[PDB]
């Protein structure tokens, strides 16, 4: 894990940009604005409250490494994404329509670029009556 913590200390230095060892909401906001994102103040506060475990309001380096350690390919996280698809599922059989999934991915929530959705659809077998098995997506994006 020594190459991993070398990369994680490397990635932590891009947010810190001095010798504090902590990340402030301002100190993260300049990084996101340098990518051209423009987040809100409560958005930055919601990002940082999901990382720390000390309650002080900044991200120390063991908290940063605890975030980067824990795995997306999880027992619970697979069930959360599977439960998120079932909101958009009529009759609950395990299939959603292709144009319904394109309408959801490009309009609701964080609006996706249309080239991304054209990639997302062709990642799965879309034919067979226009239905797509979303559990193929859940196995795909939790294969990590």
């Amino acid at each position: 894990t020594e190459e991993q913590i070398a990369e994680f200390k490397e990635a932590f230095s891009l947010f810190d940009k001095d010798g504090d060892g902590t990340i402030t909401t301002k100190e993260l906001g300049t990084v996101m604005r340098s990518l051209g994102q423009n987040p809100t103040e409560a958005e930055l506060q919601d990002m940082i409250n999901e990382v720390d475990a000390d309650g002080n309001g900044t991200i120390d380096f063991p908290e940063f490494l605890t975030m980067m350690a824990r795995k997306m390919k999880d027992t619970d996280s697979e069930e959360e994404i599977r439960e998120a698809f079932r909101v958009f599922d009529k009759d609950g059989n395990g299939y959603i329509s292709a144009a319904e999934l394109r309408h959801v991915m490009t309009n609701l929530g964080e609006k996706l670029t249309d080239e991304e959705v054209d990639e997302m659809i062709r990642e799965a077998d879309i034919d067979g009556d226009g239905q797509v098995n979303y559990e193929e997506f859940v196995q795909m994006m939790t294969a990590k």
């Binding site: 990518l35 103040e41 997306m72 959360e80 990590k144």
Partner: protein
């Protein structure tokens, strides 16, 4: 594929009145067939209720064999159960194992007992075991198991102290009564198993009255034990009964269904965007407009956005709570205080 889902919704997740008429008719024929299993033991009716139970069991083994085959085929509309290994997954769930055992043991008994008394002894238990068929998708057992599991510390507490009071009190009444004689001439509390049967009958407030203590020491111990340690067996009805009623109250303060549609959409696509990051040739990088150090910091920000979206999807499924009021006042006061800072800075910029 359309008619396959139509009959699966008729048999497996029933709703309406046509589904109610079908499942009420199945529940009545299995209950009438149980009543003939009752009448087959009365000596006046044992000849009639066996000659009409051999023929009623052939109709029901054909009927429930046909319904099991139709339901097993029609389970393929779900995406979980499509394919041969999916059908074997459908035959693994516990209500289908019960249904398979009932129909294949009915065939074994009706083929062995065709050419018979022990066959009737095997019919009667299958008549009883077929009562598990009416509760279709297990909502009865899952509702009970959910409330028993939340309240497990309290149920183990009252069962342990109730059992402990049972053992100590039945021993003290055994000591006080082991020499007493009944008015009939016999001895009530002969062994310690007799006093323990007394204790079980008393502490659950049945009181058959076959075993009653006679001496005044046994009556004094039984009075103190019956006043206090009976409540520790009437408590699981109180804990579970108030647990069901508080759960029903909590179901009326549900969030409306549209308030989780943007959160579910945001969970799906932040999770996909975290997946699309690890391919460097993807078109998901084109939002962020060369790219040596920016690969790592985009992956950190995308992982943080996934964790925030997962939290907000969990919060959109819970009922309303005081935690929601404190959370949205924190967000609203923070935005408004930043806005007064913005007006302050512009007023100090222009005028000074």
């Amino acid at each position: 594929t359309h008619v396959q889902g139509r009959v699966y919704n008729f048999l497996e997740r029933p709703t309406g009145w046509k589904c109610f008429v079908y499942h009420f008719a199945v529940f009545l024929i299995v209950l009438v067939c149980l009543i003939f299993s009752v009448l087959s033991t009365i000596e006046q009716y044992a000849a009639l209720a066996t000659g009409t139970l051999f023929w009623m069991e052939i109709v029901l083994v054909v009927f429930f064999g046909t319904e099991y085959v139709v339901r097993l085929w029609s389970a393929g509309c779900r995406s979980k159960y499509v394919g041969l290994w999916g059908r074997l997954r459908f035959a693994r769930k516990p209500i289908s194992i019960i249904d398979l055992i009932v129909v294949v043991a009915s065939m074994v008994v009706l083929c062995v007992g065709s050419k018979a008394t022990s066959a009737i002894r095997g019919i009667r238990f299958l008549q009883i075991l077929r009562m598990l068929h009416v509760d279709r998708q297990g909502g009865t057992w899952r509702l009970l198991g959910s409330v028993v599991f939340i309240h497990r510390q309290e149920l183990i507490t009252t069962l342990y102290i109730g059992f402990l009071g049972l053992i100590f009190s039945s021993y003290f009444v055994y000591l006080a009564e082991k020499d007493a004689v009944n008015e009939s001439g016999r001895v009530e509390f002969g062994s310690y198993a007799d006093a323990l049967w007394w204790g079980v009958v008393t502490v659950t407030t049945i009181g058959y009255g076959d075993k009653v203590p006679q001496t005044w020491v046994g009556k004094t111990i039984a009075s103190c034990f019956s006043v206090f340690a009976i409540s520790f067996f009437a408590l699981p009805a109180g804990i579970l009964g108030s647990g069901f009623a508080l759960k029903v109250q909590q179901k009326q303060r549900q969030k409306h269904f549209n308030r989780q549609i943007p959160a579910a959409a945001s969970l799906i696509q932040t999770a996909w965007r975290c997946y699309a990051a690890e391919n460097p040739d993807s078109s998901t990088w084109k939002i962020y407009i060369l790219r040596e150090h920016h690969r790592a910091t985009i992956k950190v920000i995308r992982r943080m956005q996934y964790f925030v979206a997962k939290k907000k999807f969990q919060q959109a499924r819970k009922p309303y709570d005081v935690r929601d009021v404190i959370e949205q006042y924190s967000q609203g006061h923070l935005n408004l205080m930043v806005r007064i800072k913005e007006l302050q800075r512009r007023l100090d910029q222009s005028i000074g």
